């Protein structure tokens, strides 16, 4: 009988206590509420360990990485509980059909100006530039803002085009990532831009760009709803309006619903439902917290109706009407990661803007980063790389949804290759075979149908008809599936290979500029099993998976 709660410090903690308060006065069991730093990254550490809060509070896009996790419980409440918020912020945080925490509510990025020192806010992103350079002249600037955050700067590179996942078909495509694209460029380079025309500087964070703004040193800002209690201390005439725009069109800002998950490991799993549904999400519990600092649009409708008369909150809704809702998919934190890194080099001009979406592009696209072992094994892994499965089909082999593991059907060509293509590069990674009587891994550069017909169902695997892979059959005999003579072409000649051990996992390795194939004993001190060297990589090339008809899957990593 007890309630932890972690919540960030921008938000009203401590109105959040009063609610803690009133739920101990009728149960009489203690409700404490922490603030602690950087509670999103340190949250999985102690979580897991047994030890972390029972209730945590943060924007929706982390929740999947934290339920992926198992960190997260399921929620149970009733039909009549879901009525009270909005279907849309339920959504937010649901992941793989189960919702993993409460949605409170719902920040967006807003447009904060000096009413007294700028009358009328800037339409566009290119207006700002001129006005800076007038306002320069009396002591002061535009625009500052947390640049060092991507949740600031993500607004306007994707407002010509620049976006995260694409979403399609109903699903986030984790390899179709526009970081990179024409449009997230363009927004990127108008604003290092900005920075060497002295117009803003790289090193404004989130404490200095609210100092100037508080002591109208400065024109504008950029924030959230929780950021109007200093500015409403400061005594500013401030008005809080749309986000301006770049090239033409709207700066589109991701959308978050500050959610509550309930710690798996928590003992007072029971106790927190109540608290949160019973107590918090209520109309007298966000006005508590509320009145702390603002939520902004919270997901209760008995409360957001009385909330949606004050016209900031109309300004907050029209930027979230412009952007993006936050995915909340566990690669959420590699492309925050990345962003993170590549609008700080690009601003502090260690790299060019080109450069540093191409390194956060491929940094989220294929190396995630998600001894006592072989030294060069240890070396190929230093160039791992992501992979899943491209459904292309009918081989007959079953693939999980997540497209990362195959195996076969019970009811003849099961056979499968890695969603990504290979043409420059050094790339590794490794595949669970464990339990399974068969199996081929390896380098495939195409089912090439067509090419000629044969190979997919006869299993005949040649480099010379660009398959380099080795093979499990009978649980214990491994082969190596090396070309064969003239005559002899229906046939691949088979080398018996020795592996001391069974390996459970085997590690890939391409270096295509090599024209080398690695394979490795990740079971045995990762020693090497075979090297195909010299081999054509005439074309792209792409990671092989087939089951053998085992029924027992081989997952990738
Ligand atoms: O900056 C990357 C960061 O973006 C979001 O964090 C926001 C948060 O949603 C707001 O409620 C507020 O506290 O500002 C934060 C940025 O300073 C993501 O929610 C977060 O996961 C990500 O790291």
């Given at each position: 009988?007890?309630?932890?709660?972690?919540?960030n410090?921008?938000?009203?903690?401590?109105?959040?206590?009063?609610?803690?308060?009133?739920?101990?006065?009728?149960?009489?069991?203690?409700?404490?509420?922490?603030?602690?730093?950087?509670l999103?990254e340190?949250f999985?550490?102690?979580?897991?360990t047994g030890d972390?809060?029972?209730?945590?509070?943060?924007?929706?896009?982390?929740?999947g990485?934290?339920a992926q996790?198992?960190?997260?419980?399921?929620?149970?409440?009733?039909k009549?509980?879901?009525?009270?918020?909005?279907?849309?912020?339920?959504?937010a945080?649901?992941?793989?059909?189960?919702?993993?925490?409460?949605?409170?509510?719902?920040?967006?990025?807003?447009?904060?100006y000096?009413?007294?020192?700028?009358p009328?806010?800037?339409?566009?992103?290119?207006?700002?530039?001129?006005?800076?350079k007038?306002?320069?002249?009396?002591?002061?600037?535009?625009?500052?803002?947390?640049?060092?955050?991507?949740?600031?700067?993500?607004?306007?590179?994707?407002?010509?085009?620049?976006?995260?996942?694409?979403?399609?078909?109903?699903?986030?495509?984790?390899?179709?990532?526009?970081?990179?694209?024409?449009?997230?460029k363009?927004?990127?380079?108008?604003?290092?831009?900005?920075?060497?025309?002295?117009?803003?500087?790289?090193?404004?964070?989130?404490?200095?760009?609210?100092?100037?703004?508080?002591?109208?040193?400065?024109?504008?800002?950029?924030?959230?709803?929780?950021?109007?209690?200093?500015?409403?201390?400061?005594?500013?005439?401030?008005?809080?309006?749309?986000?301006?725009?770049?090239?033409?069109?709207?700066?589109?800002?991701?959308?978050?619903?500050?959610?509550a998950?309930?710690?798996?490991?928590?003992?007072?799993?029971?106790?927190?439902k109540?608290?949160?549904?019973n107590?918090?999400?209520?109309?007298?519990?966000?006005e508590?917290?509320?009145?702390?600092?603002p939520?902004?649009?919270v997901?209760?409708?008995?409360?957001?109706?009385?909330?949606?008369?004050?016209?900031?909150?109309?300004?907050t809704?029209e930027?979230?009407?412009?952007?993006?809702?936050?995915?909340?998919?566990?690669?959420?934190?590699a492309?925050?990661?990345?962003?993170?890194?590549?609008?700080?080099?690009?601003?502090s001009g260690?790299?060019?803007?080109?450069?540093?979406?191409?390194?956060a592009?491929?940094?989220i696209?294929?190396?995630?980063?998600?001894?006592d072992?072989?030294r060069?094994?240890?070396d190929?892994?230093?160039?791992?790389?992501?992979?899943?499965?491209?459904?292309?089909?009918?081989?007959?082999?079953?693939?999980?949804?997540?497209?990362?593991?195959?195996?076969?059907?019970?009811?003849?060509?099961?056979?499968?290759?890695?969603?990504?293509?290979?043409?420059?590069?050094?790339?590794?990674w490794?595949?669970?075979?464990?339990?399974?009587?068969?199996?081929i891994?390896?380098?495939?550069?195409?089912?090439?149908?067509?090419?000629?017909?044969?190979?997919?169902?006869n299993?005949?695997?040649?480099?010379?008809?660009?398959?380099?892979?080795?093979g499990?059959?009978?649980g214990?005999?491994?082969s190596?599936?090396?070309?064969?003579?003239?005559?002899?072409?229906?046939?691949?000649?088979?080398?018996?290979?020795?592996?001391?051990?069974?390996?459970?996992?085997?590690?890939?390795?391409?270096?295509?500029?090599?024209?080398?194939?690695?394979?490795f004993?990740?079971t045995?001190?990762?020693?090497?099993?075979?090297?195909?060297?010299?081999c054509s990589?005439?074309?792209?090339?792409?990671?092989?998976?087939?089951?053998?008809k085992?029924?027992?899957?081989?997952?990738?990593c």
């Amino acid at each position: 009988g007890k309630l932890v709660i972690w919540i960030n410090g921008d938000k009203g903690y401590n109105g959040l206590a009063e609610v803690g308060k009133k739920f101990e006065k009728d149960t009489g069991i203690k409700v404490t509420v922490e603030h602690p730093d950087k509670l999103e990254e340190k949250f999985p550490q102690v979580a897991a360990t047994g030890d972390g809060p029972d209730i945590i509070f943060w924007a929706h896009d982390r929740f999947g990485g934290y339920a992926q996790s198992g960190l997260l419980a399921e929620i149970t409440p009733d039909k009549a509980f879901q009525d009270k918020l909005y279907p849309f912020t339920w959504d937010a945080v649901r992941y793989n059909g189960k919702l993993i925490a409460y949605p409170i509510a719902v920040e967006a990025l807003s447009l904060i100006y000096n009413k007294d020192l700028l009358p009328n806010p800037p339409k566009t992103w290119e207006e700002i530039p001129a006005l800076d350079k007038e306002l320069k002249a009396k002591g002061k600037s535009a625009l500052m803002f947390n640049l060092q955050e991507p949740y600031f700067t993500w607004p306007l590179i994707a407002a010509d085009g620049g976006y995260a996942f694409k979403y399609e078909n109903g699903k986030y495509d984790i390899k179709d990532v526009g970081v990179d694209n024409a449009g997230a460029k363009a927004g990127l380079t108008f604003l290092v831009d900005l920075i060497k025309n002295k117009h803003m500087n790289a090193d404004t964070d989130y404490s200095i760009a609210e100092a100037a703004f508080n002591k109208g040193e400065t024109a504008m800002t950029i924030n959230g709803p929780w950021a109007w209690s200093n500015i409403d201390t400061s005594k500013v005439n401030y008005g809080v309006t749309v986000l301006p725009t770049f090239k033409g069109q709207p700066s589109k800002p991701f959308v978050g619903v500050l959610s509550a998950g309930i710690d798996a490991a928590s003992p007072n799993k029971e106790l927190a439902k109540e608290f949160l549904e019973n107590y918090l999400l209520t109309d007298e519990g966000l006005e508590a917290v509320n009145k702390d600092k603002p939520l902004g649009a919270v997901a209760l409708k008995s409360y957001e109706e009385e909330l949606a008369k004050d016209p900031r909150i109309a300004a907050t809704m029209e930027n979230a009407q412009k952007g993006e809702i936050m995915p909340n998919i566990p690669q959420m934190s590699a492309f925050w990661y990345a962003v993170r890194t590549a609008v700080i080099n690009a601003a502090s001009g260690r790299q060019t803007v080109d450069e540093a979406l191409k390194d956060a592009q491929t940094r989220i696209t294929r190396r995630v980063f998600r001894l006592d072992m072989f030294r060069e094994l240890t070396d190929a892994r230093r160039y791992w790389v992501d992979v899943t499965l491209a459904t292309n089909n009918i081989s007959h082999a079953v693939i999980a949804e997540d497209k990362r593991q195959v195996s076969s059907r019970n009811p003849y060509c099961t056979g499968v290759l890695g969603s990504q293509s290979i043409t420059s590069g050094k790339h590794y990674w490794e595949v669970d075979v464990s339990k399974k009587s068969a199996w081929i891994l390896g380098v495939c550069a195409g089912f090439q149908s067509d090419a000629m017909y044969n190979i997919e169902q006869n299993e005949n695997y040649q480099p010379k008809y660009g398959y380099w892979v080795i093979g499990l059959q009978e649980g214990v005999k491994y082969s190596v599936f090396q070309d064969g003579s003239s005559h002899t072409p229906f046939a691949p000649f088979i080398v018996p290979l020795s592996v001391i051990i069974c390996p459970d996992r085997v590690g890939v390795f391409v270096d295509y500029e090599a024209c080398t194939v690695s394979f490795f004993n990740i079971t045995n001190h990762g020693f090497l099993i075979y090297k195909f060297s010299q081999c054509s990589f005439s074309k792209p090339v792409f990671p092989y998976l087939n089951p053998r008809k085992c029924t027992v899957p081989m997952t990738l990593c």
